[PDB]
Amino acid sequence: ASVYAWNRKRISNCVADYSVLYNSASFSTFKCYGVSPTKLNDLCFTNVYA
Amino acid sequence: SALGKLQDVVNQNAQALNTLVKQLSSNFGAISSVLNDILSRLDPPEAEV
Numbered sequence A: 001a002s003v004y005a006w007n008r009k010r011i012s013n014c015v016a017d018y019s020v021l022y023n024s025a026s027f028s029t030f031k032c033y034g035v036s037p038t039k040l041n042d043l044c045f046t047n048v049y050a
Numbered sequence B: 001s002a003l004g005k006l007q008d009v010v011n012q013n014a015q016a017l018n019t020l021v022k023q024l025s026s027n028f029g030a031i032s033s034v035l036n037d038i039l040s041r042l043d044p045p046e047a048e049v
Helices: B002-025 B034-039
Strands: none
Touching: none
């Protein structure tokens, strides 16, 4: 979607492997603010939104 | 209120201890008041701050 109508998807009730996101070189910017990128496989979350 | 003088000392000591334990729940401007959350959530360059 466009940026004025940006698409928000809820992510819930799943086990997430974020290690395929860190190890992929396709992303020009992979920048996390409130969490370390390498700790994402060690934590549990709710209120996940894309 | 006969034994108020001892009770004030006991209450002041307990209240000081209680406030000291309440101070652990404050983040003091950090992202969280829990050390374990910071150690589990961040890399050392931001964790040191």
